[PDB]
Amino acid sequence: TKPLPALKLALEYIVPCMNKHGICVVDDFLGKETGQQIGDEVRALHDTGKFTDGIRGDKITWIEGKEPGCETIGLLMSSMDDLIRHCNGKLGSYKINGRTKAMVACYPGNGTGYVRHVDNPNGDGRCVTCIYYLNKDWDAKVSGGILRIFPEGKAQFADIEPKFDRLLFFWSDRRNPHEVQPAYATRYAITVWYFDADERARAKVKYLT
Amino acid sequence: XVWLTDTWVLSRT
Ligand SMILES: O=C(O)CNC(=O)c1nc(Cl)c2ccccc2c1O
Ligand SMILES: [Mn+2]
């Protein structure tokens, strides 16, 4: 098929979807070839021992995007950035002016997960969580690993399967407590957090290491 | 090309 253009995707789906639900899923974000390439790069990082442990049995590594062997991860990151730019400050009241590096995370099966939590509960400036899933042929029925979100104000929770080539946005603050349910296969995800300029400048969190 | 607005999933292709 022909993928929806980035600008149209942002203005006619992501913006309205986020503002209505605070959660937004875009399936088939970059296509099979690019998705599998990202997977090859992440599996290379895992196989070369770049991951280190990060309530949760996750292993993580941070990717700037320019490192040799992470070109396709860099493309993913620039694509996320293009989507955020296209949103043209229509994501709630946020003035988005920065982001973290990419957090590559692995739950190495065997029932590993992440207990229910809020990404940013202390006002540290992160307003949007952006996650890309790269797990080829992942089936929650077999391997679990669902991301369960408990949107505030709603009785029903939202179950997000970590599907291959799947992009997810959600509000990082207390509106969206969430948990990674136990994973029974190797589960890879790439997360970027985007910052609201003013909240971040408030410096509610001071890092000393 | 169709978004069911009561849901939060759409396929780009
Ligand atoms: O992977 C998912 O589907 C959802 N992941 C998370 O919500 C998540 N959140 C945080 Cl804050 C951390 C933080 C550190 C390491 C892994 C995390 C993680 O997987
Ligand atoms: Mn989280």
Side-chain angles (χ1 to χ4, degrees), chain A residues 46 57-59 105-115 133 135 138-140 142-148 160-163 179-189:
Chain A
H46 192 194
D58 54 282
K59 316 302 180 169
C106 169
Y107 293 91
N110 285 310
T112 51
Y114 205 111
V115 312
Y133 301 104
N135 306 288
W138 185 279
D139 182 0
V142 173
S143 317
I146 278 160
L147 164 66
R148 183 162 287 178
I160 314 283
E161 283 195 49
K163 287 202 146 307
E179 67 190 11
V180 174
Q181 297 183 161
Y184 299 105
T186 302
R187 175 197 195 280
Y188 291 120

Side-chain angles (χ1 to χ4, degrees), chain A residues 3-7 9-31 34-52 54 57-94 96-140 142-151 153 155 157-173:
Chain A
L4 258 173
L7 182 59
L9 182 65
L11 289 187
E12 290 287 61
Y13 175 54
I14 300 184
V15 165
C17 195
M18 284 294 280
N19 283 319
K20 178 173 177 76
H21 300 295
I23 303 163
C24 179
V25 172
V26 176
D27 270 316
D28 312 298
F29 176 45
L30 292 168
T34 306
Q36 263 151 215
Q37 197 164 358
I38 289 159
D40 288 338
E41 297 186 5
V42 170
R43 280 187 289 278
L45 294 169
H46 192 194
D47 289 336
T48 50
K50 299 323 170 73
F51 284 69
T52 55
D58 54 282
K59 316 302 180 169
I60 58 151
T61 196
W62 289 94
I63 298 308
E64 193 278 335
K66 287 164 198 51
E67 302 96 331
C70 301
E71 297 87 13
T72 321
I73 292 169
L75 173 59
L76 171 72
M77 292 168 70
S78 79
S79 302
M80 292 170 172
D81 287 350
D82 292 342
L83 283 176
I84 286 299
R85 177 183 72 252
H86 285 322
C87 282
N88 208 46
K90 287 150 160 83
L91 290 177
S93 69
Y94 294 120
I96 294 175
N97 76 325
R99 64 165 169 75
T100 66
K101 301 165 170 189
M103 198 191 63
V104 188
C106 169
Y107 293 91
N110 285 310
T112 51
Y114 205 111
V115 312
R116 165 166 169 157
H117 65 283
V118 168
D119 274 2
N120 168 30
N122 305 310
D124 69 12
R126 294 175 290 162
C127 56
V128 177
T129 304
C130 185
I131 301 180
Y132 182 74
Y133 301 104
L134 57 138
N135 306 288
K136 172 49 103 173
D137 289 328
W138 185 279
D139 182 0
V142 173
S143 317
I146 278 160
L147 164 66
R148 183 162 287 178
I149 307 182
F150 308 85
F157 53 69
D159 276 358
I160 314 283
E161 283 195 49
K163 287 202 146 307
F164 170 83
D165 201 22
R166 167 171 273 191
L167 183 71
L168 164 74
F169 300 88
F170 60 88
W171 301 133
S172 309
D173 70 13

